[PDB]
Amino acid sequence: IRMEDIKKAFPSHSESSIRKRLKLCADFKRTGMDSNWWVLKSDFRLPTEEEIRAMVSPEQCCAYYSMIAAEQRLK
DNA sequence: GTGCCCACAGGTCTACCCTCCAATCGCCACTGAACACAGCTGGGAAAATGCATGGTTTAAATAGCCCCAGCTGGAGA
């Protein structure tokens, strides 16, 4: 993957925060091939679709959106 | 060898838990009040005792009256 795809999706995320999830599972290849890409580690098993669905629920996303909208209105 | 990133450590702030203090309620102990029972006093009722005007016998000074009772004369056998 590329880092600025994630920086386009989450632009409020700073340094450490946005790349602490790239710290694990990914490694910054910059030499020869795959240069300036974050390749997936060969020992890392990418989680299946049901595990990724079990990570975050849509209702948690709605609760987070309610929190940040109320944060804006109060601010 | 200078900008810039990630990781680890430290500090601060928030949350939860435990401890202490205060307040309230309940129970027990003591005090006060009320009710009930007993005793003493006072009043009323009943019973018992102390009554009073009649009588009484003792004459006698009288006198009318009245039953009876002798009793003696008269009559009959």
Å from the A66 CA to the B59 C1'? 164
A19 in Cβ contact with A4 (< 8 Å): no
For this PDB entry, the determination method is cryo-EM
Structure tokens of A75?
């601010």
d(CA A18, CA A11): 9
| Stated resolution in angstroms | 4.5
d(CA A15, CA A10): 11
Cβ-7 Å neighbors of strand B: A 15-16, 19-20, 22-23
Å from the A23 CA to the B43 C1'? 124
The amino acid sitting at A73 is R
A36 in Cβ contact with A73 (< 8 Å): no
Strand partners for A28? A38
A5 in Cβ contact with A18 (< 8 Å): no
Pick out the nucleotide with least CA–C1' distance to A28: B5
